[model samples]
Each structure stands twice: as C-alpha cells, then as structure tokens.
Target: VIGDFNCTNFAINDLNTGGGGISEYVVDVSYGLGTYYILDRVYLNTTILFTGYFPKSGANFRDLSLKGTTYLSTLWYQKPFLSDFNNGIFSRVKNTKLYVNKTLYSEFSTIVIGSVFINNSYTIVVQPHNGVLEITACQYTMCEYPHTICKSKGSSRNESWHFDKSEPLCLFKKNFTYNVSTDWLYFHFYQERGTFYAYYADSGMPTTFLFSLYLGTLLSHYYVLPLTCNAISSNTDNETLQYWVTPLSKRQYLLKFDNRGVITNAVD
Candidate 1:
C-alpha cells in the first residue's frame, strides 16, 4: 500500500543516523505530493507520517521507541509479526525492518530505478556484518516503470475459462499468444509467476508439448460444449464447437465470447 508524502522528504531526517542527526528528504527527490506508493516489502513505525529507525547498528541492536504512533506498516522481520524476513539477520534483533529498498514503495506511473534481479535475487555486497533491515526513510522514491505485456510485469494464462455452476473453471488445452497486432482481439487471463511458456508451438519444447496436449484435450473436453447441460448430459451431443474457441499464448488462454447468445446484457 502507498500514501502521499505531502512533499515531506526534505522535512524529515535520520533521527538515529549520527551526530549528523536528522536528514531532510527533499520533496522533488521523493516525487509529487498526495500520490500513493506501494512498498516492495513491509514497514514498521508508529506513525505513517514519520519514517525513522534505530540510532545506530553494531553489537548493541537497540530497539526504537514507538509507545504512541499510528499508521506504520508492521515489519515482516519484527518479532510477533506474521511472517519474518529471510536470511535470519533480525532473528533476535527488534525494531523495524523492511526487506528491500523501495521494492514496493513507488508511485503509480513512476519510473522506479531498480537493480538487476537475476534468478529471483538482488545482490547486495556488505562488509560481512549483519543487522536488522532498517529503512529510516525511503531514500529511493519513484514510480513504477510502465512496461509492455512482454516485459517484466508477469505472465498470463488460465487453466479454466468458462464459469459453470457445476465446475466454476474450464481448463484450456494449449497456451496461446496474444494477437498484439489485432486491436479487436483484446484479451485477459491469470498469469503464473516467474516462468511462462506458450502451450502449443512448432518448437516442441517440453513446456510447449505438455501444454499442447493438455490444451487440446481440455478444449475437446469442456469448451466444445460450453453449456453445462451439454457436457454432463449422457446424450450423444453434436460435436459442434470449433477448436479455436480457446487460444493459449504465452501461457495465457483466451475464452471466446463475442456477442454470443451464451452471454448477453443482463442488468440487475
């Protein structure tokens, strides 16, 4: 989740940084006022308005006082919280800890500068010492970089397409690609995370072949007679539905419903 900074970056500083004392985080540096930004990880502080942490890091890991405050996101690593942080840095340590630097805290439509995330990992080399993850202030503030469907966002595909009272989900046989060139062919689907591959293709890759067989069978099974009545009934139903009704592209399968009487304008 995110909230407006109200242009208060320069106004706040490191309450625990050093004799250097508090630091003013400039508004221009943070971004536009009144815009909400989601943080990559969690945050824990008494005040959502105030973003400060312990005074220092060393053998003595002091816990900051938060007797009276409101709106700070609870730290994932802070003890007594739901899920703890990975790497075991703050196991016995207290105070607030956020996992990444602005992994989530950035405005919509903002270009957030990010380090390379290779193999699900973002590298951070330190001096061999470890402490609780503390983000006194969101030093890295920006918006998420807008990207095309093929970029870093995520994958898309649906194992089930049509919603039947009996089944709720209809599986797709092959993963299909979007007709990027066809504006009329708008599409939407649930994307799997991290990895994605088309269901069926000439390449015959393992994922491709697997999805192809599943896609073809699933299509022949459910989508052929989208009507629940035709599917469950023991009658020798007419084999009528076309194979292209379900299209899978890039791990995304499409459900065809273009002005078909199966769906019509029904207002409540």
Candidate 2:
C-alpha cells in the first residue's frame, strides 16, 4: 500500500507458505498518537532455524512468540487465530514472553521485521500460516464485536477494516513555531505514515487558516506565520489559532514548548 495508509497482502501474491516470501506490509500514524509496522513475514531456503537476533541489546528476537519482549505484541482481538490478544484478561507489560508457532515446518525460514511507534496507538498481528499480517488502531476490536471485549455485552457492532494507506517505513517531517499567548508554540510533525494526511480543527474542518490583510474586518498580520516549511497559514490577533498538524512517524516525537517535550522515536 502507499498511505492515509498503504498495505499489500501477500495473500494476493503466490508464495509457498501462503506464497513465496509473503507477508503483510503497513505504514500508519494517529492524531497526537504514535506509529507502527504490523508484520508477519517469512522467507525460507531449505533449513529451519529457530533462533534470530535484534540490533539493540535487550531486544527480543523476531521469531519468538514471547509477548511484550518480542517488540511485536499479540493483541488477541486484532489477531484472527491467537485468542486473548486484546482481551481484558491479558495485559501487556514489558517483557511479555509468548512463542511463535514452531509446529509448522518447511525448512530454513528467515524473517526480518521492524517498526516505529510514533504518536499513534496501534496493534500488530501475523498469521505465519496464511502469511497474513494486519495493522490497525489499538481500539479496533472495540469497534468490531464492540462489547465482546466488554463484560456488559451489548449487541455486537458491525465493523470493517478501514485503510488510510501509505508506504512502509516512510517518514516525513514538517516543523512550525507560532505565538500562542506570551509563548511561542513550536511543533515538529511527521506527515506521511497513516490514513489521514492533514489535521482538522474542532469544527471538523480540515486544518487551514483563512488569511486577509483586511478588505474589511478580517484580522491579518505582518510577518507570515511560519507554521510549516510549506504550510499555508494565517493568523489574526487571537488567543489561539488553528493550524495543520500532519500525521507523523510513530518512531519520532511531538516536541512541545519550554523544551519539556521528549519523544522516544520508535526505532522501526
């Protein structure tokens, strides 16, 4: 897929274990949230190896099934086969150890996967058998069989998988600094990871400011409001102004003022 999202299903391709080197590919972002690459990829040659590696120290292997520790989590509700992934019964604390399905054998299947967690909340799942992988909002299941994840079960809601498609591992940044009160609001945003490319205002209007030097009463200013390098912005003498905050990478951060904002980029 190329992104408000992008994803290519290996199920569409003709690979062995579901097709050759077949896996689900994804790139996404959220509003003031973070980012993620939900994958389940497999490449085989002729010998089956159980062990794998991660670049960073204390990182989990890509092939293991241990939850939390694996980096890739098991959100049962999002997962088709794995039960209790998103169930209230399961909680994802760090270092959750789960196991990959070692029951199937083909030969030496090598798998490589990585992702970044930006300002978006997400869930990843893989079916090595179907070579199917899916990435969705962390709250997707709630939108699905709505109350199934809840105890006071109501009628299940009919839900479907929605895509805001974009390319994989792609990160684009745009910065802005605006005066809001006696302080300057500075922002650094990642713009191309999910289904929505532009930020909207509270009025449900796509983020955009109307400019007017004044034909009458429209408040206009002198210096151009430098919101983004290429952003179209306008500001009147007001307490607050709406501006675009494009979707950013899940691996990066949304820096705030007073320099107190620290973002742990998702080392995708």
Candidate 3:
C-alpha cells in the first residue's frame, strides 16, 4: 500500500534497523520549548540493534514515516543517533552579543534554549548539552561588578550570575585629595575622603597683619598679608613676601614667588 503520511505521522520506527543500503531524508523539524519534529529519517533492512546513546527525545517526526524511521534506525547503527541530532542543533547556534540602550553590553558562547520563571524571577536557561560555555557581562553599569563570575548550577551544565537590587555595586562617588607643600607653606584639601589642612610661614614681624581673604567657595577662610610696607618692612617683607597664593582661570590655585606653582591635582 503506497500512501503518503502528512506532518509527524511518518515516525522513526520504520527506519533502517541494520546496515544494508544507502538512503537520504530531510525535513524541517524543531525541538525544545516548542513544536518539535524530526528533520531526517533513514531506511534499513536488518534486525534493530538499539544503541543506548539517546541524546534527546521529541514529539514529532519528519513526514515520510517509513523512509524517516528507516533513515533514523540506520543512523543509530553507525553512531549514537542522539549525539548526531544534538550536534545538528548545536551547529545552528552561534555566539551571540547582547545589547541595551543601543550599546553593546555583553556577549557569550552559550546556546540559549529557553527561559523559565522560578523563585519569582524570570531566568534564562541555556542548553547544557554544549560543553564549557561562558556567559559574561560586558557593561559595568549593568552588573554588580564588571565581568561577574559564572558558576555551574549543580550537575545541570547550565551557568548563571545574578544581580541584587538592594546592594548595588555601581560606582556612585569617590574620594579626592589635593596636596601642596613647601618650606614655608603647606596646603592639603580633600573631598568626600574629607580633611583639610593649611599652614603658613610668618616672618615674626610685629607689623605683619592678617587680612582675612573672603571669596567664593574657592577660598575657604584664607588670610594673607598686604604687599605694602604697612604689612611688613623690606627685611621681613622680602623674606615673608617670597611666596603668595593666587587663583587662575583654570580654577587652579598657584602658591608661588616665581609665578610658577607646584601642580596639586587630585587623581580620580
């Protein structure tokens, strides 16, 4: 009886049970997480020798049942049928890159089989069949730390890393320090890592007067002596006048006598 079976009815039972002849078959089959069917089958003419190497199982068949079943049985005789099937699926997958906000964020070499909801969190699960696949985070902003460690989940072969919202690891702020020191004057200021120090050398002249300089936040309660003689005579004046502080256009403060100040900038 020559009749054609539609869709999955062809099944893999009638495929070649032993090695005897050559044949070929092909079908559009899919498995895992959705409608799955066998894509290929074979034909054989001998007693079936079962090989315990089943890689995976599915619910549908490649259309031509006799041909498909025969085709599959024949393949089993040569090699583990399951291994070949998995290899086919694995070959279809390529290393993928993930993106967010139109920016490249992360990449990995694992084939994502599907996602599931467990413990009130949606988790992405990958095919554990593939050996040694790594999942990494490309963006520091997206994870607790850049390059989070991926650990295996028991013997499942799947890998994962999780993020906790309560204890975020994103960088928000950092400490900064600025220091300037010499034989006469010393200035040290810091922000966040908070501490401020300032000292000056006095000529010990009675005429030396303290003029409290008040500017914006740039000058914080700083005092200076006048350039005039009323502040100091030439003797103590020239000695004490050796240096003075001034603010330049770059928001940089210069403590100098030669119009040059030692650079004191804070590192990030």
Each candidate: how many clashes? 30, 50, 14
Q: Sorted on lDDT, highest at the top, how do the candidates line up?
A: 3, 2, 1
lDDT of 2 at 251: 30
What TM-score would each prediction reach against the true structure?
A: 0.14, 0.15, 0.15
Q: Which portions of model 3 miss their true places by more than 4 Å?
A: 1-91, 95-115, 120-132, 135-163, 166-268
The most accurate candidate by lDDT is 3
Model 2, clash count? Answer: 50
Candidate 3 residue lDDT tens string, 206-245: 0111111111122121111111111122332221222111
1 against 3, candidate with superior TM-score: 3
Candidate 3 yields a Cα-based lDDT of 0.19
Q: What are the RMSDs of all candidates, in order?
A: 28.7, 25.5, 38.7
Candidate 1 residue lDDT tens string, 1-268: 1111121222122232234421222111121111111123332321133221111111221122121111122221122211111111111111111122433211001011112212122111110011211111012221111111101111231111111234212222122332222111111111133221112111111111112112111111000101111121124322211111111222111111123211111111
lDDT of 3 at 123: 20
lDDT of the structure predicted as candidate 2: 0.18
